Design a protein around this ligand. Structure first.
Ligand SMILES: CCCCCCCCCCCCCCCCCC(=O)OC[C@H](COP(=O)([O-])OCC(O)COP(=O)([O-])OC[C@@H](COC(=O)CCCCCCCCCCCCCCCCC)OC(=O)CCCCCCCCCCCCCCCCC)OC(=O)CCCCCCCCCCCCCCCCC
Ligand SMILES: CCCCCCCCCCCCCCCCCC(=O)OC[C@H](COP(=O)([O-])OCC(O)COP(=O)([O-])OC[C@@H](COC(=O)CCCCCCCCCCCCCCCCC)OC(=O)CCCCCCCCCCCCCCCCC)OC(=O)CCCCCCCCCCCCCCCCC
Ligand SMILES: CCCCCCCCCCCCCCCCCC(=O)OC[C@H](COP(=O)([O-])OCC(O)COP(=O)([O-])OC[C@@H](COC(=O)CCCCCCCCCCCCCCCCC)OC(=O)CCCCCCCCCCCCCCCCC)OC(=O)CCCCCCCCCCCCCCCCC
Ligand code: HEC
Ligand code: HEM
Ligand code: HEM
Ligand code: HEM
Ligand code: HEM
Ligand SMILES: COc1cc2[nH]c(C)c(-c3ccc(Oc4ccc(OC(F)(F)F)cc4)cc3)c(=O)c2cc1Cl
Ligand SMILES: COc1cc2[nH]c(C)c(-c3ccc(Oc4ccc(OC(F)(F)F)cc4)cc3)c(=O)c2cc1Cl
Ligand SMILES: O=C1C(O)=C([C@H]2CC[C@H](c3ccc(Cl)cc3)CC2)C(=O)c2ccccc21
Ligand SMILES: O=C1C(O)=C([C@H]2CC[C@H](c3ccc(Cl)cc3)CC2)C(=O)c2ccccc21
Lengths: 49, 243, 192, 96, 360, 360, 96
């Protein structure tokens, strides 16, 4: 059982990834009717005025 | 060429089969490395992530990483920029490429220390001996400028200057500083950095080997159980002898 | 005509060999040339006293003790994976055959235990030649078959009957004729 | 395997596939024999091993002395003499 | 396929006096299966690029759960593969197994060649100094034929192309191994195993209860020892110098192959002509092959008892073993005249005692 | 193994009236062997890194002798694999082969599943836009279970780790294929093939002279056609959009899978609930599996003649084929209400005509 | 395969392995029969094919008309009507 558990665990995500983080966005340059796009935790985020 | 000598065995806490690393020594060795040896060497495989929980508390490690400027980008204009280091970044390096490193060190290349004790014979004993090894030339030998005599380096002539000097650094736990102490602590730190998974490996080893040995005893008994029935058999020819 | 010409070569050589045939027994020519016979004869007094003598005595001591520990004879060391000896064993009489069977059993058991026999069980000569009269007959019988049947490289049908076709007479003894069946229960050659 | 005159059976019942190897190696019991065995649940099985230990060990060690150890000793000798030769060379060639 | 399983591994009947020395085949097979498992799970995260192979192997150890364990099991089980094979070979030299197990002995030799090739291909994949310069040396050694070496390399020098094809070849060869193992066992069970006593006997006993348990016992010991060495590192089986990144214009100052290659290395140190070097390997392997039909080289009827117990004369196989060990010793040391001299002595012994096996 | 060769491929006796429609199994096997050769020789130069896979495939085409030929043969032979498989399946739906070739039919289904998996894994390795977003979609489709998708990916999103393990899996699966093929043929020759007439007959004839030549003839045609399409590019089998490097934050504006996946795609377009989507595939495959024991679903004694010649009623298999082709058509087009409407009509036909095969 | 009462042989000679499949499928010739064949070196072999072409082609094409073509025509119809519906939609929804 220990062997199989280690072998399964070895396919799991690595210890460098961690998916942690936070970000901030300045909204002065945006114009009405426009959609801006940003990067966040590996996925895209839309901000629309 | 010649066979180089072999170093003496020092009693580092870890080189027993039941012992772990010695974490205060590791902290002090890291401090030495930062203040001295990181002037010309690099550890490209290490990230600050590695220090939290294993050596240092997270808060302090973040504050350490914040001391460096680390390059990042491109930005909206396609330019690169510098930012304060974060926990996710690798250790910084003093030279941009091997050519610059050789240019600053008279032609010789300072090796990357990420695996140094696994990349030499007798590992930490060799490193401990090497850091002690600087001495005056013998009769009949002279070395060209920017080259030094060391009794443990192969061929005895080495490009690295004498490495250590008393109270060139200071400790936060209070321990007194001298070249011998610094040698011990930095060798401890580099031995840890060579494979941080050491203690995990050894503690798992112990359970594994113990259980497997108990296994072996049980299987030996089971094998003899069947050995005995044919080892003690009787076969007679012609007529029956005993019963 | 190439083939008949080389025929002529072969035939003349064979006729030479035939013409020199004796009509009665004549002693064989020595196995070593006169130079080596001279050298050996010269060096005998040192070589036999110091080296060959003790070698040939130590050898028999080693052999005898190993055979006596286990209670084997010398002619119990030959296998029946050897055709000549297989024939010889076929020609044996009941008593000799039974005793050989028994000795082999005991030797197997003793080598399993790794226990010496008592010295009073070891009082016999192990080097009696009890298989000789039968080995000579086997040699005769198996030589005549070569002479009368094996004198040419005979031609056959390939990979048919379970035999490769290049000479075998027992089925599936070679890899390319392994696995004779895919369904059913198989069978054995001895029950045909 | 076995010679054809040994692997000839007395019975005529078809040999089942799972017994192939068993009857390829058939041998006759010339003269017959009698055997007795005890179930391993009714035998001691670690005392018989130690009871016969000294005899077995004497036999095994006696058998291996000359063939394995004496050439071993000679080889160990040769290594020591090689070390001598080298440690003398290294001074002759390079020490003033 | 169950009926075959029962015929060959349950009802198969052996001789009563088969001791441990007949258990090492099973053991090498098991190290094969185990090495295959760890192989495949290492392939899932390895990178076959000269620019980054090294760091790819380091990533497993540093950043992957149980990453270190599979690499180290794979590294250490190789040594046991070779150790078990050598014990397994020497047993049959000692017994003169090849007297009647002709094709089994041939198959054995082919399997050993396969194993050498597999190991050496593996040895290049971590891509350190020793890997690069070892590949350089062995590719230069098979130079006699034009253009074959740039072709097999893929290039004028050892390259990323070379790494890619070495990786694929190292993937494939073990399974060809497995096929040849099936062939091996076919020839074996066609005949039947020999005794340590070298007699023919009717005191046979079935496999499943008695011999299966001995196999299992030895298997326990081997799993034990592999884990001991893997987890704690008792012996310095592999030299440190593969820990350094490659440099194409600077050799390492001291050189020591993996132990199972040292004897060969010793030869390359002591014979003057390079072709003589290569021919020694070819000749010794041909001599071993020649033992398959030793019954024909003489008209005296042959026996398997070599009467080596209590014998002051010893036997040619023992002299062979000690000569080989001496060659390993000399392999390990620096190039110096005296080492070369005793090297040549040992080499002559190693060659002669192999030639002489045919002279009964 | 020669005796088996002769028993099954030379002396084996068939029915006189086996026409070309019974030659397509041999053909799919041959495309397998051929695809394996080109696979292995492509592996020698491919790079399994997300940073550089794409350029690795371009290097073969641009800078390697005959580099282009192996890539294009490998790409084009896949289409023929699937085309031959579909003809081979439809033949046995038409004949009701599964009436008595029960386990052969089951084995067939397993082989088809293996082939789908193999192809889709291959489709990701060139690492273009379509590859990345296809992998994203199919991995999201099997999401219902926690943590299974990050585990199988290796990561929170499609990554270099994903590429590495896809490459190894694509390496391995074909050979498992081969093993299952041997199993397939065992079940087949256990029974014996059916006629186009669906009667039992004694007018048999041996294989080697008559049927072997027809196999060879069709083989010539297939090799011809593969080379024609491979060298000249007559049909746009693969969409251009895999020619663009990957971008993780922008999808391609128009999407068309490989043709052998379009029908499935059509379903994912028209059924509202995602789970309903997945369940349609599961249900249809279960229905096909259920045909293996059709003799039990009724107490009337069964015949293999479906009397489809001259029949105004046609047959459920023909309606199935036309429904499937219609679904391919709709697969190909943009998402629009009317396409979805006729999609749903065709989907209902496709499901119902599969259910109804059991109702004799 | 064949029923057990058909695959029961009259001979008693052992079936060789390379003939396995041949005798698993044995069938009786109920009533017996007579057959004649000519060596293919003494036959015309491309004229007999064309001589019987029209009959064969009539048979094959007749057999497939209803089952394959009529549903084909209906499907082709459906595609044309779908195209109509789409080309009307695209104007209704987006043209003023
Ligand atoms: C998978 C296989 C495919 C299925 C089909 C089978 C294929 C085999 C066909 C080839 C054989 C053709 C020759 C026919 C000979 C007929 C003679 C006869 O009447 O038969 C009785 C006769 C035995 O009766 P006997 O004399 O009573 O027996 C006593 C003993 O023979 C002891 O007698 P002795 O001690 O008195 O000495 C006698 C010896 C005295 O002579 C010597 O000993 C001379 C020694 C001098 C040293 C030089 C080497 C000699 C060998 C030559 C090899 C060259 C061939 C390869 C060429 C490569 C070209 C690319 O006589 C000979 O050597 C004469 C025969 C030598 C012929 C050997 C080569 C024949 C091959 C020709 C075709 C080559 C094309 C191959 C293409 C590439 C692929 C392989 O048959 C033989 O001796 C057999 C000879 C042929 C070898 C066996 C065939 C191999 C079968 C196993 C297949 C292995 C394939 C492995 C690949 C696996 C892939 C996965
Ligand atoms: C004990 C042996 C172990 C063998 C291991 C081999 C290595 C394996 C490596 C791979 C791993 C495999 C794992 C499985 C191994 C096998 C296991 C097994 O079942 O063994 C059965 C073995 C023998 O069974 P058997 O039924 O007698 O076997 C039949 C015989 O072989 C008899 O067979 P035969 O009579 O039929 O003969 C056939 C022939 C067939 O021929 C062969 O098989 C020959 C093979 C030779 C090897 C050839 C290849 C070599 C290749 C080169 C390798 C180089 C490696 C370099 C390594 C360097 C390392 C530094 O064999 C022979 O002739 C063999 C006899 C050789 C005699 C040599 C005599 C040498 C004397 C040396 C004296 C030294 C004195 C030093 C004094 C120093 C003073 C300062 O029995 C045992 O091992 C009994 C169990 C003992 C367990 C004891 C555990 C104690 C633990 C204590 C813990 C303490 C803790 C304290 C804590 C305290 C806390 C306060
Ligand atoms: C001809 C057929 C070819 C078939 C090819 C198939 C595709 C293969 C693809 C993969 C590659 C494989 C390669 C090998 C292929 C086979 C080769 C072969 O041996 O064929 C035998 C084939 C038929 O042999 P057979 O013994 O009669 O076969 C038995 C029958 O099947 C009868 O069997 P049964 O009676 O036992 O029935 C069992 C049943 C068993 O069921 C099945 O097998 C059903 C299978 C159905 C397929 C299901 C899967 C579909 C999956 C979806 C695929 C989608 C693909 C999308 C592609 C889009 C492309 C745009 O089969 C049937 O029921 C089949 C009957 C189907 C009737 C359908 C009627 C449709 C009528 C259409 C009329 C169209 C009119 C258009 C008017 C337009 C006006 C504008 O005969 C030939 O091909 C004779 C050779 C002809 C050579 C001619 C060459 C001429 C070259 C001219 C060059 C000119 C150059 C000019 C230069 C000028 C310079 C100045
Ligand atoms: C710049 C002044 C350096 C400092 C500070 C440290 N090292 Fe270094 N090191 C430097 C050079 C130019 C060289 C090359 C030496 C040569 O002969 O080419 C080195 C080498 C080493 C080595 C290699 C030893 C060997 O046998 O190859 C080691 C192990 C080493 N240095 C360790 C080391 C340590 C522990 C340091 C902190 C105490 C340290 N070095 C500082 C340049 C410089
Ligand atoms: C008898 C079977 C095998 C033997 C003897 C063998 C031998 C070796 C050896 C000696 C190494 C060197 C490892 C090191 O130096 O750290 C190695 C590495 C490797 N082997 Fe094998 N191997 C075998 C089977 C396999 C198989 C079947 C695979 C994959 C299917 C495989 C994949 C690998 C990989 C990926 C490495 C690289 C290890 C690394 O980079 O750290 N091996 N092998
Ligand atoms: C992967 C490599 C090998 C495997 C898996 C293997 C496996 C086996 C096995 C399971 C046996 C029967 C049980 C045993 O003897 O332990 C055996 C016997 C034998 N093997 Fe191997 N073996 C290998 C390599 C070799 C080699 C390299 C040789 C010879 C050079 C060889 C020659 C023999 C012989 C002669 C026997 C039978 C000896 C006798 O019956 O007296 N094998 N092998
Ligand atoms: C039935 C067997 C196989 C099928 C159906 C198959 C299918 C495919 C497909 C559809 C592709 C996509 C190629 C493209 O989009 O250009 C591909 C690529 C590939 N296949 Fe397979 N494959 C098979 C066997 C193999 C085998 C056995 C190997 C290696 C041992 C292999 C190695 C590869 C490689 C390396 C690629 C990458 C091609 C490239 O990057 O251009 N394939 N395969
Ligand atoms: C790699 C995939 C496949 C291979 C290599 C293969 C191979 C073969 C071969 C060689 C035959 C005998 C000759 C012939 O019919 O052409 C056969 C027959 C058959 N196969 Fe397949 N096949 C494959 C896939 C399938 C699939 C997907 C199915 C069903 C869904 C299937 C079901 C059958 C049936 C029912 C027969 C016998 C039909 C009859 O005797 O009337 N096979 N196959
Ligand atoms: C102590 O004395 C003995 C020990 C012995 N141990 C074993 C393990 C066997 C044996 C090995 C393999 C086998 O069948 C197989 C072939 C090949 C395969 O393939 C592969 F690759 F190994 F998995 C598997 C399976 C059948 C039997 C013996 O005969 C054997 C004989 C003696 Cl005298
Ligand atoms: C037109 O009518 C027919 C055509 C037919 N064509 C063929 C090719 C066969 C056939 C296939 C494979 C086989 O044995 C093998 C199994 C598996 C292997 O493995 C692998 F992977 F294919 F190489 C190889 C070989 C034995 C026979 C038939 O039975 C067959 C039967 C009919 Cl009625
Ligand atoms: O100089 C050598 C050298 O000579 C070998 C040799 C060892 C023996 C090998 C070998 C010889 C014969 C066979 Cl059958 C198999 C392998 C070939 C490479 C090395 O392995 C090596 C590795 C790294 C740096 C230098 C060297
Ligand atoms: O939206 C899709 C999509 O829906 C699929 C689908 C096609 C059908 C596939 C499939 C379905 C069922 C089975 Cl049994 C096998 C494959 C799964 C991926 C794609 O292949 C694709 C590729 C590139 C970009 C977008 C897409």
């Amino acid at each position: 059982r220990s062997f199989l558990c280690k072998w399964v665990h070895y396919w799991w995500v690595s210890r460098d990834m961690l998916a942690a983080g936070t970000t901030e966005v300045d909204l002065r340059p945006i114009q009405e009717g426009m959609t801006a796009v940003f990067k966040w935790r590996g996925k895209p985020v839309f901000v629309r005025h | 060429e010649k066979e180089p000598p072999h170093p003496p065995s020092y009693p580092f806490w870890f080189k027993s089969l039941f012992h772990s690393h010695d974490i205060p020594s590791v902290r002090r060795g890291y401090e030495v490395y930062r203040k001295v040896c990181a002037t010309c060497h690099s550890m490209e495989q290490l990230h600050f992530r590695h220090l939290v929980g294993e050596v240092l508390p997270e808060k302090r490690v973040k504050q350490i990483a914040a001391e460096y400027d680390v390059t990042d980008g491109p930005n909206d204009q396609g330019e690169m920029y510098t930012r304060p280091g974060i926990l996710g970044d690798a250790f910084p390096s003093p030279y941009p490429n091997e050519e610059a490193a050789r240019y600053a060190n008279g032609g010789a290349y300072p090796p990357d220390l990420s695996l140094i004790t696994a990349a030499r014979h007798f590992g930490p004993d060799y490193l401990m001996a090497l850091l002690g090894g600087y001495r005056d030339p013998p009769e009949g030998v002279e070395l060209r400028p920017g080259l030094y005599w060391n009794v443990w380096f192969p061929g005895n002539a080495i490009a690295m200057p004498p490495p250590l000097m008393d109270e060139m650094i200071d400790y936060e736990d209070g321990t007194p500083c001298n070249i011998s102490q610094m040698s011990k602590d930095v060798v401890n730190f580099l031995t840890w950095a060579t494979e941080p998974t050491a203690d995990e490996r050894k503690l798992y080893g112990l359970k594994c080997v113990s259980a497997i040995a108990i296994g072996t005893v049980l299987m030996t008994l089971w094998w003899r159980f069947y050995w005995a029935m044919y080892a003690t058999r009787r076969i007679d020819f012609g007529k029956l002898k005993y019963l | 005509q190439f083939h008949r010409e080389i025929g002529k070569l072969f035939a003349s050589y064979s006729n030479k060999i035939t013409a020199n045939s004796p009509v009665q027994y004549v002693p064989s020519p020595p196995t070593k040339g006169k130079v080596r016979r001279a050298l050996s004869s010269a060096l005998m007094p040192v070589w036999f006293k110091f080296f060959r003598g003790p070698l040939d005595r130590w050898n028999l001591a080693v052999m005898a003790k190993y055979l006596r520990d286990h209670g084997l004879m010398y002619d119990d060391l030959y296998s029946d994976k050897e055709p000549v000896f297989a024939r010889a064993l076929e020609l044996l009489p009941p008593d000799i055959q039974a005793a050989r069977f028994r000795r082999l059993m005991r030797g197997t058991y003793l080598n399993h235990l790794r226990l010496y026999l008592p010295v009073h069980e070891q009082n016999y000569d192990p080097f009696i030649p009890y298989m000789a009269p039968y080995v000579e007959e086997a040699k005769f019988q198996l030589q005549e078959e070569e002479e009368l049947l094996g004198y040419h490289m005979w031609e056959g049908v390939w990979y048919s009957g379970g035999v490769t076709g290049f000479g075998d007479k027992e089925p599936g003894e070679h890899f390319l004729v392994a696995l004779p069946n895919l369904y059913g229960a198989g069978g054995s050659p001895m029950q045909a | 395997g076995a010679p054809k005159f040994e692997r000839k059976m007395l019975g005529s019942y078809p040999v089942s596939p799972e017994f192939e190897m068993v009857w390829r190696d058939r041998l006759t019991a010339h003269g017959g024999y009698i055997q007795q065995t005890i179930s391993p649940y009714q035998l001691k099985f670690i005392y018989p091993f130690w009871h016969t230990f000294f005899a077995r060990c004497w036999c095994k060690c006696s058998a291996y002395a000359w063939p394995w150890v004496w050439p071993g000793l000679i080889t160990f000798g040769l290594v020591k003499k090689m070390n001598h030769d080298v440690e003398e060379d290294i001074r002759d060639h390079y020490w003033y | 396929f169950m009926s075959l399983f029962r015929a060959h591994l349950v009802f198969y009947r052996c001789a009563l006096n088969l001791n441990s020395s007949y258990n090492f085949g099973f053991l090498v097979a098991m190290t094969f299966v185990l090495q295959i498992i760890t192989g495949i799970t290492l392939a899932f995260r390895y990178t076959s690029e000269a620019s980054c192979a090294f760091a790819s192997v380091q990533h497993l150890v540093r950043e992957v759960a149980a990453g270190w364990e599979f690499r180290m099991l794979h590294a250490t089980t190789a040594s046991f593969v070779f150790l078990c094979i050598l014990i397994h070979m020497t047993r049959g030299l000692y017994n003169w197994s090849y007297s009647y197990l002709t094709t089994a002995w041939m198959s054995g030799l082919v399997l050993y060649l396969l194993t050498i090739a597999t190991a050496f291909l593996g040895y290049v994949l971590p891509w350190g100094q020793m890997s690069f310069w070892g590949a350089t040396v062995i590719t230069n050694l098979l130079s006699p034929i034009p253009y074959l070496v740039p072709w097999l390399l893929g290039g004028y020098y050892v390259s990323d192309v070379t790494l890619k094809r070495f990786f694929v070849l190292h993937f494939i060869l073990p399974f060809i191994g497995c096929i040849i193992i099936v062939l091996h066992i076919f020839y074996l069970h066609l005949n039947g195993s020999s005794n340590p006593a070298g007699i023919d006997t009717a005191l046979k006993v079935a496999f499943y209860p008695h011999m299966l348990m001995t196999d299992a016992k030895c298997l326990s010991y081997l799993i034990g020892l592999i884990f001991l060495q893997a987890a704690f590192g008792l012996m310095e089986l592999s030299h440190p110098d593969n820990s350094i990144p490659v440099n194409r214009f600077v050799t390492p100052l001291h050189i020591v192959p993996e132990w199972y290659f040292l004897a060969y290395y010793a030869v390359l140190k002591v014979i003057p002509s390079k072709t003589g070097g290569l021919l020694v390997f070819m000749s010794s392997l041909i001599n071993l092959g020649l033992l398959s039909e030793i019954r024909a080289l003489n008209t005296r009827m042959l026996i398997r008892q070599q009467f080596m117990t209590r014998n002051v004369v010893s036997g040619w196989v023992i002299i062979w073993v000690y000569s080989m060990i001496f060659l390993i010793i000399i392999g390990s040391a620096i190039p110096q005249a005296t080492y070369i001299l005793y090297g040549r002595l040992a080499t002559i012994l190693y060659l002669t005692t192999g030639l002489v096996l045919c002279l009964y």
